[PDB]
């Protein structure tokens, strides 16, 4: 009967739900990319600084021996 009319309405309504949930998920994932930006930058910085420090330590070592 018309329970095929309502059902088709629930169907489309429910299809709108998925579309919404998909947008929602996409949005969430996209916004987290800024956290990844931070993490990425933080590690980069650590890498650069640990690398810089090791070279300062080699110079420190040299000076230690260059000190008789």
């Amino acid at each position: 009967g018309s329970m095929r009319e309502t059902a088709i309405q629930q169907l489309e309504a429910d299809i709108l739900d998925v579309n919404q949930i998909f947008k929602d998920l996409a949005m969430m994932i996209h916004d987290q990319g800024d956290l990844i930006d931070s993490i990425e930058a933080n590690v980069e910085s650590s890498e650069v600084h640990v690398e810089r420090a090791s070279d300062q330590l080699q110079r420190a070592a040299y000076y230690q021996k260059k000190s008789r």
Binding site: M3, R4, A7, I8, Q10, L11, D14, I15, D17, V18, I21, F22, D24, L25, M28, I29, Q32, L35, I36, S38, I39, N42, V43, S45, S46, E47, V48, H49, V50, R52, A53, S54, Q56, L57, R59, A60, A61, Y63, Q64, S67
Partner: protein, 63 residues
Amino acid sequence: RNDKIKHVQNQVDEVIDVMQENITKVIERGERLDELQDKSESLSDNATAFSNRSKQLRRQMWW
């Protein structure tokens, strides 16, 4: 007709079921990213403090 609605509806309800779990995962993912950002943050802070202490060590060794 009908059924091809029912057995096409809950097909949707299924996708809704998967996605719903997915947003629970993304929320979990956001939280782990949050902790990751805080830790890579201390590392960075510490990596820099380390670099500054190494420069001092060099100057100190040269004197």
